[PDB]
Amino acid sequence: DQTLKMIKILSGEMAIELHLQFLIRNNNTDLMILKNTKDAVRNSVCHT
Amino acid sequence: DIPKGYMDLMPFINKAGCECLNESDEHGFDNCLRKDTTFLESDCDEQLLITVAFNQPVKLYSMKFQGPDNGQGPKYVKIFINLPRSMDFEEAERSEPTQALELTEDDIKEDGIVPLRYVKFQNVNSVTIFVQSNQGEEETTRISYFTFIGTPVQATNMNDFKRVVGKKGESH
Amino acid sequence: PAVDTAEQVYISSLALLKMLKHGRAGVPMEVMGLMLGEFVDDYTVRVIDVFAMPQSGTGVSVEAVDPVFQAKMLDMLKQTGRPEMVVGWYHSHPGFGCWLSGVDINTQQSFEALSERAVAVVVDPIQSVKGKVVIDAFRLINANMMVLGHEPRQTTSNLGHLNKPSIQALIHGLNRHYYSITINYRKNELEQKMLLNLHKKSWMEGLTLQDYSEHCKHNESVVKEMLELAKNYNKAVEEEDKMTPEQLAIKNVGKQDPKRHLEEHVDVLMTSNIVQCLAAMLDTVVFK
């Protein structure tokens, strides 16, 4: 019961799920910058 | 058996290089290299010195120094790599070995493969085995089977040079 | 597959010395020899020994590798304890820098036929005349992959772009037909404590009192020139022209009176005198 929930919380399941939810929901990246970087790479170094 | 991605070095053993010391005439070195009951014994004492040569530099991963369970099988094995000259029994004891092995009864068995420290054997050209004692303390020791498991290290055969591009007479 | 720009041709201390000596013997011509080492792994080519091949009218070409000479040399070196493989070849480019010509490229391809990693080394005994050692390691760039893929070397690391290509190598075909390999010098102690003996200075040199005659002459000359320099420093400081003094100190910069020919001489004089006096007292104490 309660001990199972505490065990789960310590193990890192709940925390990881909450962090993933926060990151995914508020994930808003300026993809135009990465598009510009893509059109500025002819050297495989700058590719990786 | 054998480990993944590795091959036995039987095809890579140069018969010219191999030479045994203290081997009995009745049972020679060639017997210990065959997967038969034929075995190699040492005529004058329990100490034996078996050296093998490799056509091209080979890598050493695991060696199977099998022997009879009667007690005359190898017990303490000393190994050296890339010996410029033949080994003397008095000098062999003095020198430090590349990997001193104390073969347990399990290793001597037909299915027993004794691991070797792969790091040390990277450019082995000729490995010499010094059986310093047998399990049963018998007068003579025997080696039922013996071969090395590893990989062939690509070696430049400058004896096979030959121009592949360009015309003769060129200079610079 | 692809060669990493992180590959490093390890050249041993003995190998570099032998290659330089062989190159300096041949000048005004071109010498060549096979390099003995190991292809320890994909990102490293280690050369331990280099043995010169006899000079021949052919020059540095596939026919300079006398098969009988090479075979007997390797066979006899195996007995001594050097069972190394042929990892590459080296040839001296007197005058011109480290690059590869057409015949050089053909010989390099012939070597590659045996092993895909047969590095080629070029050493110029004339350029390497001072603390600079102009030594380059070159291998052939499959002109096919020039279009099939793109460049020939993966850049998985930064261990290779810490070097710069040379206009010479670029003109003669660098990054086009040949690509350089970073040359790392494998030096160890014993081989570095033995080489600090070329000029090690005997204990006696550190107890010789020089000679007092030329010591006095040197002291007198330095003191007279320092008196002249002190006159000049007097003139410079007492002037102290304030017409933008920050600009004055920059419009009279010529390695002159103020401090350069100044206390430099003070240091010379004081070092010489202190060392001489300390040596004299150490001798007066040690020797009776």
CB contact burial B135-151 (16+ within 10 A = b; e otherwise): beebebbbbbbbbbbbe
Q: Hey, what are A39's tokens?
A: 């059109």
Q: Are C10 and C114 in contact (CB under 8 A)?
A: no
Q: Give dist(CA B107, CA B145) in Å, integer.
A: 12
- Residue A17 structure tokens: 């799920």
Degrees, nearest 5: CA angle B58-B103-B74: 90
Q: What angle do CA C216, C222, C227 make, to 5 degrees?
A: 125
DSSP state of B28: -
The per-type count for chain B, helices as H runs and strands as E runs, is: 3, 10
The Cα–Cα gap between C102 and C60 comes to: 11
CA distance B145 to B7: 16
Residue B91 C-alpha, separation from nearest chain C C-alpha, in angstroms: 17
DSSP string, A1-48: -HHHHHHHHHHTHHHHHHHHHHHHHH----HHHHHHHHTT--SHHHH-
CB spacing of B154 vs C67 below 8 angstroms: no
CA–CA distances in Å: residue A48 to residues A20, C28, C157, C163: 26, 48, 11, 21
Residue C125: closest CA among C145, C98, C144: C98
Distance from CA of B102 to the nearest CA of C (A): 28
Judge whether C110 and B164 are in contact, CB under 8 Å.
Answer: yes
Query: Would the CB atoms of C62 and B57 count as touching at under 8 Å?
Result: no
Q: What is the DSSP track for chain C? A: --EETT-EEEEEHHHHHHHHHHHHHHTTS--EEEEEEEEEETTEEEEEEEEEPPP-TT-SSGGGS-HHHHHHHHHHHHHHT---EEEEEEEE-SSS-S---HHHHHHHHHHHHH-TT-EEEEE-TTT--SS---EEEEEE--TTHHHHSSSSEE-SSSSSTTS---HHHHHHTBTTTEEEEEEEEE--TTSSSSSTTTT---GGGGT----HHHHHHHHHHHHHHHHHHHHHHHHHHHH---SSHHHHHHHT-SS-TTTTTTTHHHHHHHHHHHHHHHHHHHHHHH--
Comparing CA positions, the residue from C31, C76, C35 lying closest to residue C54 is C31
Sort out which chain A residues have CB atoms less than 8 A from C161's CB and list them: 45
User: CA-to-CA distance for B127 and B61, rounded, in angstroms?
Assistant: 12
Q: Retrieve residue A5's tokens.
A: 């929930």
Give the mutation candidate from C48, C66, C86 for the B interface (greatest B CB count, under 10 A).
C86
> How would you classify the pairing of strands C8-12 and C178-186?
parallel
Amino acid at A31: L
CA dist., res. B74 & res. B81, Å (int): 19
Q: Quick one: resolution in A?
A: 3.0
C157 touches chain A (CB under 8 A): no
**What's at B69, amino acid-wise?**
D
| Nearest in space to B146 (alpha carbons), one of B69, B40, B21 | B40
Amino acid type, B111 = D
Question: Which residue is associated with the tokens 């690059």?
Answer: C99
Partners of residue B85 in chain C, C-beta under 8 Å: 79
- Calculate how close chain B gets to C83, using CA atoms only, in Å: 8
Angle between helices A13-26 and A2-11 (to 10 degrees): 60
CB contact under 8 A, A45 and C154: no
